[PDB]
UniProtKB/Swiss-Prot annotation:
Free-text note regarding domains: The WW domain is required for the interaction with STIL and KIF20B.
Organism, as annotated: Homo sapiens (Human)
Record region (Disordered): 28-44
GO molecular function: beta-catenin binding; cis-trans isomerase activity; cytoskeletal motor activity; GTPase activating protein binding; mitogen-activated protein kinase kinase binding; peptidyl-prolyl cis-trans isomerase activity; phosphoprotein binding; phosphoserine residue binding
Function comment: Peptidyl-prolyl cis/trans isomerase (PPIase) that binds to and isomerizes specific phosphorylated Ser/Thr-Pro (pSer/Thr-Pro) motifs. By inducing conformational changes in a subset of phosphorylated proteins, acts as a molecular switch in multiple cellular processes. Displays a preference for acidic residues located N-terminally to the proline bond to be isomerized. Regulates mitosis presumably by interacting with NIMA and attenuating its mitosis-promoting activity. Down-regulates kinase activity of BTK.
Positions of the PpiC domain: 42-153
Gene behind the chain: PIN1
EC number(s) reported in the record: 5.2.1.8
Name of the featured protein: Peptidyl-prolyl cis-trans isomerase NIMA-interacting 1
Length: 153
């Protein structure tokens, strides 16, 4: 059972029986979905994302700040913060993307439109294609920085 990338695991804290995905870095208590060996994988998907860059990003510069100086570690803590606010409903994805994304797509609520296999950096692509419409990833790492991907179509 269990769709691509999903492994059962056991978290400290308690009898955290939970589910995690090694492609998307998503985690959750709930079992992923249903008896249909596949579903396949669309030729195309549509995703938004929120990018936080750091000093080791291939371009330490964004519309939000000319010289980015945060460390990969600091950026990772920020992603975790936003993921917390998002998962709790305090703030929504589009809102934090518009405000804090270091991608120019910030001004599109983070929307990147539809794409295929081949077009995006591979971990982003692998994660986007492992998500299902509606699902959000954990922190995803690329040469740009650290992403949160929301799959919209």
């Amino acid at each position: 059972k269990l769709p691509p990338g999903w492994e059962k695991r056991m978290s400290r804290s308690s009898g955290r029986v939970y589910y995690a995905n090694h492609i998307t870095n998503a985690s959750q208590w709930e079992r992923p979905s249903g008896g249909k060996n596949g579903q396949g994988e669309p030729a195309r998907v549509r995703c938004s994302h929120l990018l936080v860059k750091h000093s080791q990003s291939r371009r330490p510069s964004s519309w939000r700040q000319e010289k980015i100086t945060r460390t990969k570690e600091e950026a990772l803590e920020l992603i975790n913060g936003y993921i917390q606010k998002i998962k709790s409903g305090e703030e929504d994805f589009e809102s934090l993307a518009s405000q804090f994304s270091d991608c120019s797509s910030a001004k599109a609520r983070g929307d990147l439109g539809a794409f295929s296999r081949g077009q995006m950096q591979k971990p982003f692509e692998d994660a986007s294609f492992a998500l299902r419409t509606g699902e959000m990833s954990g922190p995803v790492f690329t040469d740009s920085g650290i992403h949160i991907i929301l799959r919209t179509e």
